[PDB]
Write a protein that binds this DNA or RNA. Structure first.
Lengths: 205, 92, 203, 93
RNA sequence: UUGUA
RNA sequence: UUGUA
C-alpha cells in the first residue's frame, strides 16, 4: 500500500510553524540603545502630551520563537535584572503595522550587514483604557478612546540567522513553563504567551 | 473644579456621557476618569468628572440627577472621601 | 485624489469575525444529558482505562461568542451555580476534529426544527491522569493522556438552542472570565487573551 | 518496593529514562511516576519508581549512577521522606 | 483545587 | 505593581 498525502489545512484551522535550535542563532553586540522615555511617571507624561497631538499610541511587538529540548522558547530582551520586553516599539503615525515592526526589529536586533523578517501572524491585542499600567486583552464597554493599543506578531525564524544586541540589553530565551501563570514574574502579556501560542502547531528541527 | 457621577451602567461611556451634559448644555468637560476593577478593568459605575465652570456645576448638581442615562439617575455629588465610599459600597 | 486599492491581508494576520446581539439568540429546554462519568475518580478511572486500548483521549470544545454592549460574550454551560463548561466532548477514535465537534455540539445543542468552524484558538494537554492541564507538552512528557482542542464557532445571525434540563446556558462577558481562573478554570479564563487577536464586528 | 531517581534534567522524558533501565537487565518496571511543579508542570528533576524484582533495585543503585542520562549521572536511592526533603531543596535551583 | 443536581 | 540600570 502507498502513503496518502495529508493535504495542508486552511491556515485559520491549522497553522504549522518551524522552530530551530537556539544554537542556529548567533548573537553579537552593538552600541547600547537607551529607551526614549526614562522613569515610570516619565513615559506616561510623554504619552499624555503625544496623545493630544497624534492620538492613541500604536505599539507592536514581535515574538521570536526558538526551541530547546522540544520546547518553545521566546526571546525576551532584558534590561537590568528583572525587566523584560518583547523586541518592538512605537509606530510612527500612518505606518503600516507590519512595516513598522520590521523597522523596529531591525532597529533593535539588526545585523550590521540587510536581513528580512517573516511576519504574517497576529497573535494578540492589548488595550490600555486610561493613562496607567492597567492593560486588558479587550476594550471595556465604558472606554471609547483607549490611550494605547498593542498588537502582537509571531515572528518566524529561518533555519539560521545572526542578530545584534544593544550593550545594555541582555537577551534571554524564556521557555514557556517559565512564563505560564507567572504574571508576577513577567507581567500579563508576556506571561500569557504560552496560551496565545498553544494554537500553533510547532515543528522542532 | 470637579465632581462625582454614579449609578450608571458599566457600559455608560465618557463619550455618550458628554452627550448627556451637552443636552443640559454645558460643554465644560475638561476630563473624565472612571473608577474600575483593576483585576478586569470593568467600570465600577461612577466617574470622577472634571469641569471648568462653576455655574454649570450647579446645573449638573441641580438638574442631571433627574434624567435617565440608560434607565438610571446620575447620582451626582461633589468630590469627597465620604461620598466615594457609598459609591463603591454600591459595587457590592 | 486617487487612492490605491488596499491589498488583501492573509487571514493569519487579520481574522475578521462577525458577532451578533445576544438577544438574537434564545434557548429551549430539552431531554437532560448526564455525563459519561459521574463521580470525580470515575472520569480518571475511565480515562486511564480508555487510554490503555484507545490511546490518547482527544477532546474538543466550541467557543460560541455573542456580543452585547460592544463586549464579546462566550456561551458557557452551568448547573450548580459554580460549574461552567464549554460545549463539546471526547472524540471517537479516528474521528475528524471539526466534523467531530459539529456532531457533539448538535448532539448537545440541537435544532430539531448548522455549525460553522474555521478557527483553532487553543490547545491544552493533560500530562498525567491528574487534574493539571497545560497549553504545552512539558519536556519530560512524551505521551500525554488527554488532548483538548478549542475552536471558534461562528454563529448564524440568530438561532435556537435546545438545552438539557440540568443546564442553564449563560453568556459570560469577557472581563467576567479575565484573570478569573478561580472561577472558570485556566482554559476558560484565558479565553479573553485567546480571543483578543480577532477583529470582531458588532452587528 | 520503590526507589527515587534524581540529578535528572527537566527534559528527561519518561521514555529515555526507561530506555536506560532495560539497558541494565531490569525488565520489571512499575509506575515511573515523575514529580513536577503543579503550576507549570515542569519536571522536578526526580521521579518515584517501583520495581517488581527487588534485587534489580540494587542493580540500579549500583549501576545507574556512573551512567549518563543527558550528560548527568543519576542518583538511585531508596524511598525516604529525607530524600524527599533532599530533592525538593534541590528544585530551588 | 471552575465539580457535583 | 515584570520597571530602573
Amino acid at each position: 500500500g502507498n502513503k496518502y498525502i495529508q493535504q495542508t489545512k486552511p491556515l485559520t484551522l491549522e497553522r504549522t510553524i518551524n522552530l530551530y535550535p537556539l544554537t542556529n542563532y548567533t548573537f553579537g553586540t552593538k552600541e547600547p540603545l537607551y529607551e526614549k522615555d526614562s522613569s515610570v511617571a516619565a513615559r506616561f507624561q510623554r504619552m499624555r502630551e503625544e496623545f493630544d497631538k497624534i492620538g492613541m499610541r500604536r505599539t507592536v511587538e514581535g515574538v521570536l520563537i526558538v526551541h530547546e529540548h522540544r520546547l518553545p522558547h521566546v526571546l525576551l530582551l532584558q534590561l537590568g535584572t528583572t525587566f523584560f520586553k518583547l523586541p518592538g516599539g512605537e509606530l510612527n503615525p500612518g505606518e503600516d503595522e507590519v512595516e513598522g515592526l520590521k523597522r523596529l526589529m531591525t532597529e533593535i536586533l539588526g545585523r550590521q550587514d540587510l536581513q528580512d523578517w517573516v511576519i504574517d501572524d497576529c497573535i494578540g491585542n492589548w488595550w490600555r483604557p486610561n493613562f496607567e499600567p492597567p492593560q486588558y486583552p479587550y476594550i471595556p464597554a465604558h472606554i471609547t478612546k483607549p490611550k494605547e493599543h498593542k498588537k502582537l506578531f509571531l515572528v518566524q525564524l529561518q533555519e539560521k540567522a545572526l542578530f545584534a544586541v544593544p550593550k545594555n540589553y541582555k537577551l534571554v530565551a524564556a521557555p514557556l513553563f517559565e512564563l505560564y501563570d507567572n504574571a508576577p514574574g513577567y507581567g500579563p502579556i508576556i506571561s500569557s504567551l504560552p496560551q496565545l501560542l498553544s494554537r500553533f502547531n510547532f515543528i522542532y528541527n | 473644579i470637579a465632581l462625582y457621577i454614579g449609578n450608571l451602567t458599566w457600559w455608560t461611556t465618557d463619550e455618550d456621557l458628554t452627550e448627556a451634559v451637552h443636552s443640559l448644555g454645558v460643554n465644560d468637560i475638561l476630563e473624565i476618569k472612571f473608577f474600575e476593577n483593576r483585576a478586569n478593568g470593568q467600570s465600577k459605575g461612577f466617574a470622577l468628572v472634571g469641569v471648568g465652570s462653576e455655574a454649570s456645576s450647579k446645573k449638573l448638581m441641580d438638574l442631571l440627577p433627574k434624567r435617565e442615562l440608560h434607565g438610571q439617575n446620575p447620582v451626582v455629588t461633589p468630590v469627597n472621601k465620604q461620598f466615594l465610599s457609598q459609591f463603591e459600597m454600591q459595587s457590592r
